[PDB]
């Protein structure tokens, strides 16, 4: 798990990383540690990414919002745990870290555990985009821009989602 929790690099949420696993954690280093169905195996999967502090609430069954709808979706019947910690010291830089991105536009909501890494221009209006960004023709990913002085809700949080199949 040190490979997962102490990975030096984390994924953008739109390109969330998934590791096949084939009470020590349950640690004062985490700020969120919520389990569903199977409170504290065939297969275990560790999905990890970075989102804003105030989006961690979206990494839970039955949630809505740009992260849950367009970036990472858990099923109603989720059995697994959601673990998060503040990573402002790692993922913010003076001037801003713009390397972390999220998907802002999509023609439909993700299905559970679906991953969308498309960079296709999003047609928001009546005119086809033909591959070019412009009015009502949007590049579908947007940078976070994590600055060290941001409030806590706007700071980067690293998230690990453990699924029990």
């Amino acid at each position: 798990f040190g490979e997962v929790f102490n990975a030096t690099r984390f994924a953008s949420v739109y390109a969330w990383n998934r590791k096949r696993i084939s009470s020590v954690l349950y640690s004062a280093s985490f700020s969120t540690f919520k389990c569903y169905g199977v409170s504290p195996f065939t297969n275990v999967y560790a999905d990890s990414f970075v989102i804003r502090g105030d989006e961690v609430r979206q990494i839970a069954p039955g949630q809505t919002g740009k992260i849950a709808d367009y970036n990472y979706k858990l099923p109603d019947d989720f059995t697994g745990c959601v673990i998060a910690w503040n990573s402002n010291n790692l993922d913010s830089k003076v001037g801003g870290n713009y390397n972390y991105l999220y998907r802002l536009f999509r023609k439909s909501n993700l299905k559970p555990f679906e991953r969308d890494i498309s960079t296709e221009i999003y047609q928001a209006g009546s005119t086809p985009c033909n591959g070019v960004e412009g009015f009502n023709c949007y590049f579908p990913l947007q940078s976070y821009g994590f600055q060290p002085t941001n409030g806590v809700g706007y700071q980067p949080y690293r998230v690990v989602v453990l699924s029990f199949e």
């Epitope: 713009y98 802002l104 536009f105 928001a124 209006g125 070019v132 960004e133 412009g134 009015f135 009502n136 949007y138 590049f139 947007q142 940078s143 821009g145």
Partner: antibody
Framework: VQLVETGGGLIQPGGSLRLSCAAS????????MSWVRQAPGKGLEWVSV???????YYADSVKGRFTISRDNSKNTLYLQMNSLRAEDTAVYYC?????????????????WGQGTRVTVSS | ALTQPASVSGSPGQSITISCTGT?????????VSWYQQHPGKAPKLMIY???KRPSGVSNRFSGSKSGNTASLTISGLQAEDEADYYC??????????FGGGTKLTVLG
């Protein structure tokens, strides 16, 4: 939520000048930003726009002479104006595109700076 | 450039309309007409977007419409504070915009 332009002044014909537009209360890195100018006593004229991925568009009256850009870290928009002519004399406004909560443009401009005057004259 | 009357005027309490005549590739092609109010020395203020819609806070005395290549702004119940310059604006295709030349609205005193 506001926009504050600086950099205007008197400049000789043929000269160059860079205008700045500092945003407060939103990020230019996540919004669709334009410059619009207004000659003294005259009407508004759209000049240029920049999209979040960097793609830019320009009025034909300024294409090849002006460049719109932004510095995300300073949360600032710029207009670099080269080879200025008398006809470029105007108040220059930076403006935010009006969007819905989903960040889709309505085609209108909701937040405007106070303007900065540029006078091209010898 | 969209074509607006240079001057329109009316008495307090009356209604007036400002027209904005463009072409088939701007007003004619989209439902993307906006209108702006501009008081002396101030920046333009958005009054109408998408031909007919009002931003929150804008009085319902202001309304917009379109027919063919001509958009119109109507102001009912004219009040002294409405005296200002008004500009129409249309999307023009290819991520460009066009403005009218502006109308001076006088509330006759």
């Amino acid at each position: 939520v506001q926009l504050v332009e600086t950099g205007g002044g008197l400049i000789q014909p043929g000269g160059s000048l860079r205008l700045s537009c500092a945003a407060s209360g939103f990020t230019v890195s996540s919004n669709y930003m334009s410059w619009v100018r207004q000659a003294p006593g005259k009407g508004l004229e759209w000049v240029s726009v920049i999209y979040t991925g960097g793609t830019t568009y320009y009025a034909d009256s300024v294409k090849g002479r002006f460049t719109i850009s932004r510095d995300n870290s300073k949360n600032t928009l710029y207009l670099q104006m080269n080879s200025l002519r008398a006809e470029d004399t105007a108040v220059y406004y930076c403006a935010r595109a009006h969007v819905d909560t989903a960040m889709v443009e309505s085609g209108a401009f909701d937040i405007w700076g106070q303007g900065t005057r540029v006078t091209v004259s010898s | 450039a969209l074509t607006q009357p240079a001057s329109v005027s009316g008495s307090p309490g009356q209604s007036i309309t400002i027209s904005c005549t463009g072409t088939s590739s701007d007003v004619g092609s989209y439902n993307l007409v906006s209108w702006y109010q501009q008081h002396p020395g101030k920046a333009p203020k958005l009054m109408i977007y998408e031909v007919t819609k009002r931003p929150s806070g804008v009085s319902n005395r202001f309304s917009g419409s379109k027919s063919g290549n001509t958009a119109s702004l109507t102001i009912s119940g004219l009040q002294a504070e409405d005296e200002a310059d008004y500009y129409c604006c249309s999307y023009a295709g290819s991520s460009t915009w066009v403005f009218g030349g502006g109308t001076k609205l006088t509330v006759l005193g």
